[model samples]
Target: EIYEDLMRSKMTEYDKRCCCLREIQQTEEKYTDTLGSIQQHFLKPLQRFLKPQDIEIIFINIEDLLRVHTHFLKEMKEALGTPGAANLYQVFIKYKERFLVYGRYCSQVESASKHLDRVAAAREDVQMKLEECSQRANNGRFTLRDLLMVPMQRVLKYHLLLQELVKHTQEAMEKENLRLALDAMRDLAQCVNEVKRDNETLRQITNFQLSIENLDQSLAHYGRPKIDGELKITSVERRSKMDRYAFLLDKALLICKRRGDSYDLKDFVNLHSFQVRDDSSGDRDNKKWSHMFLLIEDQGAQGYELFFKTRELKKKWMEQFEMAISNIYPENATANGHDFQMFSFEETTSCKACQMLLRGTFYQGYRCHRCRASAHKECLGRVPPCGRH
Candidate 1:
């Protein structure tokens, strides 16, 4: 009775694993089909009424996604047909880098949605076609908006499926393969989230730039804005603390003071000549001030004491300041001087420059013959000169 019970539990677990694998296969086909239909019906058809760039704005990177998953589905079918085979992780591991397109797609979801809305509103032909295509493509069950979200939903769902598969997996080697694939999927998910946040920050800064009435220059010339907040400003020359809205662009700090409904650009601190210090630590006077930090300009004559409402907020601002400063003067002065030999990664590893995973089984990237360092082809030029190991 005990033996029979143990065997039954084993069979149930095996069935559960099979169920997860089956779901992955089925969902992937549907996901790819949704992407293909969008490409076939919406994108291809709209090219007559819309410019190429405008169509791109509506359906960003869906072509790349469709191309990737079509091949992926083919590989998955081949891998599934073999008996005693568990090479499905190989497909995911190989295709991981290509999945970065989803990051760009996810990040630009806001921009895409706005563009789609604008196009739909402006052109009756485009609007009619959009409705017609979306209805036909989705079997009248989903709109273009709903279809656009499918990529985001499907990309986010991979980790969950992998987790469930890993939970029921009993073979140690197979489990490790699945776990590695899971890690890669998890990494991609994180990359997507971070890119989304970063893009949203830039969008916010762009919107904030519009409210500045007295600014003489376009903030676009400053590269990208890193951070922005309403800060309590204190200086030695001023007796009273002032609340100022500040934006840390790639080049400098655009400090604005409120003037009625708009803001006046009161001070522009060039990032080229400034230092950041934590005022929450050290001296008796500084110790009395919580959530405080200092931005001291060169020559020690001018300093700005900024205060935040909470310790966490202070830390966040301080960290941004540090990143901004470091970015201004990158410490790595070494140029790319490596004699790179094309190499294939045998196992999952990260690029030496971008620190992102290198995908695929053959000639994944170039490697330094001297130091044995590896980086993606595009990232090869960004890495410092190779050193003898």
Candidate 2:
């Protein structure tokens, strides 16, 4: 049943993609050919060189995953055409493991593909006709930069699907299969740092798309931070003090962008020119929620006071922006012990009692039935009541 439902979802996604992302105004034919170019020009040409026993078998698996889905949708569409009693669940169940395992491989394949592009470009004629496969709607013509997104998304989708499946998943054998598949696949995906990059891109795209209030506000919406609600901003000048609406990009670097009073837009700074500083005040933690600061070095907005909905979010921004800047010019920067706080809590939900996050080696915790907050098994007695909202 899960197989049929999920498989149908996959079919629909390809159908939509074939129609092209609404974000872009391009022909369905262009998008179709772009993906087709990937299989034909890129995959087919490289197959002879890719070889057996190559971990690059990952590329084939990824391509085949899409190909299988492309055709599966056609087959399923046909099944829908003459539907007396189609083998919806049965047909999908037959290929369940193959699709699951393929998704697992697709997640890890991108980083390897990324590395191969880096290293393999140096060896022999890696030049490609697939170069033409770049997104027609995107300003630049780049292939994997855009569409590798599909498989990367599939990887995350697999994790979530398996998690949900393991809960209502009735068949004992099916549950175990999902559990083991998710475990191994997640471990493998983590090994490549760029898979996280894929995820970051996914997050930004989602954040950008779902920004209902801000999407058409201006070009300012491009590459903005994906957070809840509208940010109330202000101009940083004595002469021009008013609401200063803007967007910030934390994806590749720190960026500040604004829509122009005139439509063409002027309030923009690229990654190259932008720089920032955290509150150097020793009692930085003592800074008020409504009050904090980031010193933009070059924009001449040297001492900019910023506000957040909460002090915690403000602090989170400071550390993250500082960390991003430090990454930009690591030679001039140093990281303190607390810098790692950014990557923490990401790996695990905190135990409500001990309040310590548990990840790879952290003690497996129990969940409060009412709250679902994970806790150290020993600390379950200390759990507060899961009150109704």
Candidate 3:
């Protein structure tokens, strides 16, 4: 009777493994088909209206996922059909590297979803077309965002299925192989998690760009700004201390006056132009006025005195500014041993190459550390070599 009970337990383990394998193949079949439906219903139609690049930005490798899973499903079906002739672990192992594409796909999911949302919100024609596609794709049951989420969900499902398979397998070699596949999925999921946070940051910065009223369109020339933080502060001038919102970015500091839902960019200063210094003189007199800092804009004579709400907040902002400056011109990077660096001109200066006036403020052109020679951004390629000092 003890031997009979042991045999029964062995059969139960086999049954569980079979169930997990079946789920893996079944869900993959459904997922692949859904990917096709998305391509047919949404992506194909979008191609007519948007440029291929823009469509790619919105859909972002759905076709690649479809192509990958289509082949994956075939192998899965073959492995499951063969019964005792095959093990599923080897199939997963084969496709393990290919599954890393999910990391890229998952990272871009937030931006893709938000991009679609913003476009549809702004354009009535786009909203109608998307609504029509959504209706046809899932019969009004799920939206485009819902379909976009399926790839991430499917990748996560893989890890869960592999975990269950690993738990149920009794054979030593099979269990080890299954664990290896599970570990790959685990690593891929972790990568997805990390990239997703950075993706969220990108989304917030994009939204902030759209929310500004009088934003400098040329801000994009600063090599994709990374936001540090935002603060509520008072701008101290000769006769007035006025409330303002300070948005700290890696390349520039945007001071704005909040009006209703939008921000009017009042002061835009590139971090390369100024020096950040702490001002705690008022702290000795009044606790409320303790947190203060100054941005020495021009040789310390001209600057903005900004008051923060707390000492710790003031320190944090100052640190961010310092980090931004260092990051922009790390160790005063050199080119052709010339030690050229980007600098915002305080006054109008002509490019040494084309002799055209360096246009605009806040990182208008590049300057050489060796000779102090300046050139417009476009004229940098046409400029002469720096002289040895």
Candidate 4:
């Protein structure tokens, strides 16, 4: 089922490309006009070597070829818009110079083919060599080394073919032979499609090789004893801590429930302590420790606040508890909270500045002050008119 689904998805992508190719072909005249001007000045020199018949066949192919080139460019733009697809564009550019070399070869082929008997047989040999190179590249074994080398060879061949076709088209146009010129131009355009097809094949092979390498590395690393063993130990320790923290948190919550007060030590302990089993273990332990220390220290400083009317002593106990917890825990740990309500108004205000808001009226507007640029009177340290309220 999975294989079938993957095949179906691939077929859909293939169909989309086919549709795009058809659309591009329908508008070949537009691309021809655009590329024709460039070809006349740049490619006219090579026409001296191309025969009349060669020009006819080449021009016929150039029209379809140009459409393919335009389509490939469009496809590239689409692919680059997707996440993880930028790498394909990078790879394409890396081998861009090779494609230019290929274009030069096509020009040489047209020139050689035009004056086949007059030019040294060595020119024909070079064309044959280029054709053989393209064949080998297209049929070569799929390996990383071949993957890189083959595209370069194919690109060189296709580029040369394209240039030769352009040269022939230019010569025909100079002689006022519109039909022959158009045929040569069409063939030149077709070469663009041919090169793009080869390029896409090379890209697929390289990407597949990369994927396999990544999968191998992941298996090798995760298959080891150290990683798995460490993970298991960590999981066990985490579960044990969670269980302990949950018991303490429930006890703290019970105290808060009985007190029915918001500002009491019981409320603070319940809010700060591990209200959650998995995610709030560390928070619960710190709160329990802080409240316990406060209760113990008040015995020495206030001498039992229940018996004495020493409000100063109670304040001293609260201050001592806060100081003890702040000293015992790391700065980050002290700042971290499982719930938003645990943080004071000032701490919450600081969090809002950092765009980390919880259960507040300003949560939606928690963007950077510079970007959003809407200064709240409270956030900007301005005293609101209703300070008395």
Candidate 5:
């Protein structure tokens, strides 16, 4: 009986050891399978989203891991406590370490893949914008050239008229007709000089237009990147110097010679010259100035009339300027609040026949359009004609 009991006890102990070993083996296999799946599905895709700099960061981290102390394997081994637990622990630890290395690699691959996708998207967007700009440039080229031709043709017409006047003046001078000759000479000289100035102005405008075209081409080639820091600072410095020079030059040239005439000078100066307050005004006024001077004594009256006329002209030419500026600089107009088509004459208050808004204004003879009465231009279209019904 003693022998049999001892034998049974030995068998029981053997069975328990076997069961523990089997359980440990199964647990290790499960851990490996789960970790491998996580790396393939989750970690890999995330790593692929990294940019170049981010990839560098990841690489540095990986290197550090290799260089630094990583005792995950040792910890895992110490957790197992079976008859051959030490050996089993080492094996399992090795397997786990291999998984860590592979996971890192997988993350990097995923990041690289995502970075490539983003680069491709950016390239496609840039290509599309370039194509659009090219189309706009082609359309604008013909219209701008035509606008330039209009001024050139006007200059030619003026030249022909001046030539005819000169011929008449020579004929009058030969007959000793002093008065006729003087009138013709004056007209011819004025017309000839005006035409010449117009031609020069046209030339300048054409050159500017060409420069703008070049700018457009450059913009298409390389879309406007943010200006570098150094370039921005340089530009600011140049602008500051120019502004100071402009202010001084303007002050020195102030003396309204045509103040008596109803010529608008607001466009030339922000405020009255005398209104400019300065401590050295008395000394500056006594100095000999060589530059052209113009003194505006009655800007309020002149400005009022000029403003009225200009406002009217602005309404009349709004559509034309809109079309011209759109052809020349569509992007600039779009950035401003002027991209939409201008209002038609019929749509404006100026087109209303009753001129309700102009009732008390300086405009006289305001009458209703329905009554077929004459009225100021301001009143002529200020309101819709009364209903005949």
Candidate 6:
């Protein structure tokens, strides 16, 4: 009779709908009854097998295990009730885990699997409800046995998902942070594997990561995208920079500029070989000057200079840079105990002649007699005759 059910090639469109209604009514009770069985199946059987402490841990994670299923059930029912739902939804529950759980967030699979393992091991009745759920899922292609492992299988995927995420991220600090997260997620996946009992759970937990493949491939470029803005690179005795180098610093590369038109002022230096010369701002009576320098080791560039429109802007960007480079070049992150603090260079109002930062409130530097270029009082004589000159 079951084999004959598939032989209904003569059923017309109306007959198919009529037949589906009967099938839906029949399966409806199975799902409703199975749903109840699932809730207490483990609660009753596992409690008998588990001790008090095991009960405590199992309850903590077991609550979450059901939540994953709850979402699957919602998707399954919502799609099934429709007459011609898209074929994509046939395996909706299969890929539902990605949307339900791994949406650009961190994972806590180990914490969850700990309790899951306790309850899973302590119960034999778990399989009954799973079979019931799968019977209704994807033409019964999925099994209650299969559905039971989805959560554990996803725990394993958490590692691969994040490992993929790490590739797309560009921010040095963010990438570093993600690498650390990967380790945590890896441990989580390992714990999930360590905890699952046999091949049955493993077989059931597996599914395709097809849904998130697009995001999975494209997420990293946003990690450190080039920020757009304009700021003079203060290329006086300093550097003529902007549209030039500020955007690349987040990637751990720094470019030197001639700050002014002076080719003699030119030099390019590698941050890896650069040195921090001055990181200070002070005056006893009152803060007179606020500036610092990053002396370069190479002879051609003399030194990579630093100046901020305001002393605070100078110090602010510097700190943010150092923090990022601390995690760059993983092997060299701790190399020689030096620093890789480079700026996040972007456009900002800066000095006219020297192109030094001019936003500070303290000093009133001289402006070009004609054009808008202004500079520190001492830099006035040195700048090329200012123009709009």
lDDT, candidates in the order shown: 0.75, 0.43, 0.71, 0.30, 0.29, 0.40
Q: What tens digits encode model 5's per-residue C-alpha lDDT throughout 176-258?
A: 33333233333333333433443444344344334331122221211111111000001212322111111112112111212
TM-score of each: 0.67, 0.30, 0.52, 0.16, 0.16, 0.26
Error of 4 at 56 (Å): 1.9
User: Can you tell me which runs of candidate 1 are displaced by over 4 Å?
Assistant: 1-11, 49-51, 122-131, 208-245, 248-252, 257-266, 270-301, 305-388
Clashes of each: 0, 2, 0, 29, 16, 20
Top candidate by TM-score: 1
**Model 4 alpha-carbon miss at residue 82, Å:** 1.9
Residue 81, candidate 5: how far off, in angstroms?
A: 99
Task: List, residue by residue over 157-229, the lDDT tens digit for candidate 2.
Answer: 4345435434544556645655664554453344333334445555555654443232334322233243322
Alpha carbon lDDT at 221, candidate 5: 17
- Deviation of model 5 at 201, angstroms: 3.2
When summed lDDT is taken over every stretch of 10 residues in candidate 2, the lowest stretch is 332-341
Tens digit per residue, CA lDDT, model 1, 1-389: 32122112246888999988888888787778777888888888887888889878878888899999999999988887776448988888888877888877997887898889887899888787877886777556667876677688778778888999999999999999999889878878866775676566556667877888777777755645778878778887974778898888756788888888888899888877888888745233433224788888888878988877677778888888887665554443224557664464555668888777664333455677677788776676677677733
The C-alpha local distance difference test score for the whole of candidate 3 amounts to 0.71
Off by more than 4 A, model 6: 1-245, 253-270, 279-290, 295-302, 329-389
The sequence of per-residue lDDT tens digits that candidate 3 reaches over residues 1-389 is 32122112246988988887776766777778888988999999889887777787789989999999999898878877785524666777677667767767888887789988998898889998988998887668667877788788777667877899889888888788788778766655654564565556555677778777798674544433544334444443553676777677767888888888988898787776788787868567656635778887656545777777667777777777777776566552454455556776666466777664454434556788678888755565566676843
lDDT of 4 by residue, 1-389 (tens): 32122112244544543443333233333333333422342123335655566444333233333444555555555644565232323323333432333333343333333443333244775345434443443332222212222222333333333333233333333323333323333333444444444344434434433333212221111111110000001121232211110101111211111122221122122222221111223234443222211122212321111111133332343343343333222233212221111221211232333222222221111222222222221232221222122
True lDDT of residue 310, candidate 6: 54
Q: Which 10 successive residues of model 4 have the least lDDT summed?
A: 224-233
Report how far off residue 257 is in candidate 6 (Å).
Answer: 11
Q: In model 4, which runs have C-alpha deviations exceeding 4 angstroms?
A: 1-54, 57-60, 86-108, 111-154, 157-389
lDDT of 5: 0.29
